[PDB]
Every structure is written in structure tokens, then in C-alpha cells.
Design a protein around this ligand. Sequence first.
Ligand code: 9YQ
Length: 257
Amino acid sequence: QWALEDFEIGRPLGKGKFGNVYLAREKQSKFILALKVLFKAQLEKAGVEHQLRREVEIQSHLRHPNILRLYGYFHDATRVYLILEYAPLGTVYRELQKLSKFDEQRTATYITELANALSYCHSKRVIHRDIKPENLLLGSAGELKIADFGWSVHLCGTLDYLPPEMIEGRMHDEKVDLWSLGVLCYEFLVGKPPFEANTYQETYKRISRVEFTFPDFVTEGARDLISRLLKHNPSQRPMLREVLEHPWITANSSKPS
Ligand SMILES: CCC(=O)Nc1ccc(C(=O)Nc2ccc(Nc3ncc4c(n3)N(C)c3ccc(C)cc3C(=O)N4C)cc2)cc1
């Protein structure tokens, strides 16, 4: 059992189409968290009510330090309420806007944390998560959090992290997450994703043909990891544990492996 009157509400942390996210506090415990408010009107008007309920079941049964936790959920008259972990330091995207680009040590550490979280996801038969920087949150210690369990709260950015097999409407694997990592790692180091262009058409062209280059300052190890991940055909992409044990990752990250 949970009800709305069990929570004090503070400010909106994000406003969205399918719903909003609020800072909140359970009244008895005084414990800070977040309350996602989704409108049933707009959930049935995309036929996803039982696509949402699957994600609720997915996220509630995931316990991982780098996955945004789902404590519980309830419904009133017309809205679904998700009781969610609050991440005090905001989106990885914002951090990247401030710093422009990340250094090798933070990048590799973030990539470690994602890879662990994703390996865990793959172990629970969860073969894909979205991990664009806007959908990755930061905990109180700066530790990275996969937050995307549907219906998020945020130039050609839509295409930018999609692998060829998806843009091309072919079948897509657990290897999609590897392409995403490739894209993130590049973005962290460079401050731009690898296939950015002024038109969707051009971005497609570059994704499709895997055409990208590195600025001078990117080191050969970083270049090696990224080139290993950005492969057109997904079966050539390395396994998640080849990422956790890559020379550049172990050399530069703090979180062990
Ligand atoms: C000049 C511009 C600038 O830097 N200006 C600025 C101004 C203000 C701020 C700022 O206080 N931003 C901030 C700080 C903390 C959070 N935490 C958070 N914790 C948990 C969240 C969640 N957000 N929301 C919205 C999600 C967002 C995405 C996804 C996929 C999932 C979630 C989600 O499910 N939950 C539960 C959010 C926002 C930062 C920067």
C-alpha cells in the first residue's frame, strides 16, 4: 500500500508529455525520493498501459547501485504514481554541458559503471536500455544511474545514438547496448556524439556507413575501445566483459573489475 497523502511534494524535477517528476518525501520517514506522475489519458492514447506495466515490473525487480531504483507504485482516479530513487546531482548531460567534455578518468569510470549495470541487465534478460546522457542520472557520490524505464523527461539528437540495425529497421540484439557505449564514450571525451550533422539524412549516412573521426587529443586506447564498439554488424561488437577488461578502461577507471 502507498497513497499520495503519504508524500510531501516539492519542486518539479522534470515536466513531460506522458507525465511529470517531482521531488518528494515520505511523511513518516522524512526520506527524500521522487514521484513520477503519469496521466492515464495519454498512456491509453499510445496503447502502452501494459507496455508501461512491464517496465514497472522490470524496474522494481532490479537492484543495482548504478540503476535508478523503483521503490513502489500506486494509482488514484486517473494517474499512475511511480515512487522512484532521487539522484541529487542531475543528468550526465548537464554535467557535460558545464564541463564541455570529460577527461579520461571520469569517462572510463562512467563506462565501467554502465557496463556493470548493463551486464546485470543482460543477466536478468533485459537486453536493451536507453543510455543517452539525458537519461543517465548522477547519485550523491557522482555515481552514474540508468534511469530510463520508459517515458523519459527531456541537434539531430534522436538518431544520434541509434545503431544502424535500428535506423535500418532490421532485427536488433543485446548488441545495441554496445553501440550505445561506443557512442557515449566518444561523447564524453569529445563533447559531441560521433555522427552529428546538420540534417537527419547526413547523420543517417554517417551512422549507416560508420563514418566518424577523432580530434587529435583522443588517445589510441580510447580510439581502440570506441572503434571496437562502433561496428556496423552487431556480432563483431565485443562482449560487455571485454569492455570492463579493456586496457584503457582498467588503466583509467576507479571502480574495479
Ligand atoms: C545553465 C543550465 C544548468 O546547468 N541548469 C540547471 C538547473 C537545475 C538543475 C537541477 O537541479 N537538475 C536536476 C537535479 C536532480 C535531478 N534528479 C532526478 N532524480 C531522479 C529522477 C529525475 N531527476 N528525473 C527528472 C528523471 C530524468 C530522466 C530520466 C530518464 C528519469 C528520471 C527519473 O525517473 N527520476 C526519478 C533532476 C534534475 C541542473 C542544472
